[PDB]
Design a protein around this ligand. Structure first.
Ligand SMILES: O=C(O)C1=C[C@H](O)[C@@H](OS(=O)(=O)O)[C@H](O[C@H]2[C@H](O)[C@@H](NS(=O)(=O)O)[C@@H](O)O[C@@H]2COS(=O)(=O)O)O1
Ligand SMILES: *[C@@H]1O[C@H](CO)[C@@H](O)[C@H](O)[C@H]1NC(C)=O
Length: 346
């Protein structure tokens, strides 16, 4: 079937997944479009050797390209089906698998952590396949990929300028990558990946990965405090590129790193207060879609068309935003408990 995205393993074999196998990207071109959607996959991270070894046994797909299929079907925002992707179905579609376990921050050649270099390489190869004629490059991503967008969107804009392609408009779409460096509901020592407090996880990770953060955010904090720049509300104010933020107010990954296990009155208040704090961080982000749901990720799920805030679908909010850069803003739920929005996914 001609709508499948096809796998290209990177020609520069020194840019690799964790285990040294080549990184790569899936692509399907669309002749009648100047719009490029480049999606960064997510799936947590690993911040020390012991935890990376465990991940390599249990989730090898996220550390290696050995078994990646030669094709994949685009879903959600990467779908070519009009009913599934009403405005952008005809776009040039790219899926970049996540095999670096570094929130796309690794910038140096044990395990290799090369996420930032993988993005740089994919952009380089795409230029020869038609990216050089693009009007819009939307760097999109879910979960660790959504954080990856915040970390890389301005680096891609600068890359394209440097290479001599200044007319391409680089923009970002961060889905489920806007986290709070908050106090846990119940303290736990940083041992396992999924329950390690967000502040400590990144403090450890950035050193282990030799990770890099955006230049504009790095200069705001003291040398050694670059971990700050992994948190959306800290990185966002200094971005040069336009970025649309999609974020469930009660994100399941946030609740997990906060050591919440799912209700007593103390936990109800903790969870309610999370939604409030998140809402506060989005107060001055007009390009936002933030429903009051307990969920995680949305933009490559087939049902992304069905979620609404203030009578507006997510595809429509994105179309409205695109058009405003060439129908409403700050689509953040006012209702204050998880799943108060009738369109929340099951
Ligand atoms: O509408 C299209 O996307 C499209 C229309 C053409 O019928 C077809 O060209 S061809 O019949 O002359 O080959 C065009 O082919 C693309 C092909 O889909 C691409 N495959 S991909 O890399 O997996 O996306 C690629 O091979 O480029 C072909 C040429 O496209 S062009 O550069 O726009 O002419 O698809
Ligand atoms: C290939 O990738 C490696 C690792 O990032 C880099 O050192 C090397 O210079 C790259 N080759 C190029 C850009 O030709």
């Amino acid at each position: 079937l001609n709508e499948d995205l096809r796998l290209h393993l990177l020609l520069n074999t020194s840019v690799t997944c964790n285990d040294g196998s080549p990184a790569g990207y899936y692509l399907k071109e669309s002749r009648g479009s100047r719009r490029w959607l480049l999606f960064l996959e997510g799936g947590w991270y690993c911040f020390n050797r012991e935890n990376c070894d465990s991940r390599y046994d249990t989730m090898r797909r996220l550390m290696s390209s050995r078994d990646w299929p030669r094709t994949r079907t685009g879903t959600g925002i990467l779908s070519s089906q009009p009913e599934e992707n009403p405005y952008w179905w005809n776009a040039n579609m790219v899926f970049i698998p996540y095999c670096s376990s570094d929130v796309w921050s690794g910038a140096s050649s044990e395990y290799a952590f090369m996420g930032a270099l993988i993005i740089q390489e994919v952009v380089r190869e795409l230029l020869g396949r038609g990216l050089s004629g693009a009007k819009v490059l939307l760097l999109a991503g879910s979960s660790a990929g959504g954080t990856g967008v915040l970390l890389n969107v301005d680096r891609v804009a600068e890359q394209l300028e440097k290479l001599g392609y200044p007319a391409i408009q680089v923009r970002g779409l961060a889905d489920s990558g806007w986290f709070l460096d908050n106090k846990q509901y119940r303290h736990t020592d940083c041992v396992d990946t999924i329950t390690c407090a967000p502040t400590e996880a990144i403090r450890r990770g950035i050193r282990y990965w030799n990770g890099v953060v955006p230049e504009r955010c790095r200069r705001q904090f003291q040398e050694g405090e670059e971990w700050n720049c992994f948190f959306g509300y800290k990185v966002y104010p200094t971005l040069r590129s336009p970025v649309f933020v999609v974020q469930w107010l009660f994100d399941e990954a946030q609740l997990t790193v906060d050591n919440v296990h799912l209700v007593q009155e103390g936990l109800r208040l903790y969870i309610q207060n999370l939604g409030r704090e998140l809402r506060h961080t989005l107060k001055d982000v007009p390009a936002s879609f933030a429903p009051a749901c307990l969920s995680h990720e949305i933009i490559i799920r087939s049902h992304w068309t069905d979620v609404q805030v203030k009578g507006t679908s997510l595809p429509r909010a994105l179309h409205c935003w695109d058009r405003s850069l060439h129908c409403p803003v700050h689509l953040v739920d006012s209702c204050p408990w998880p799943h108060c929005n009738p369109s929340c996914p099951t």
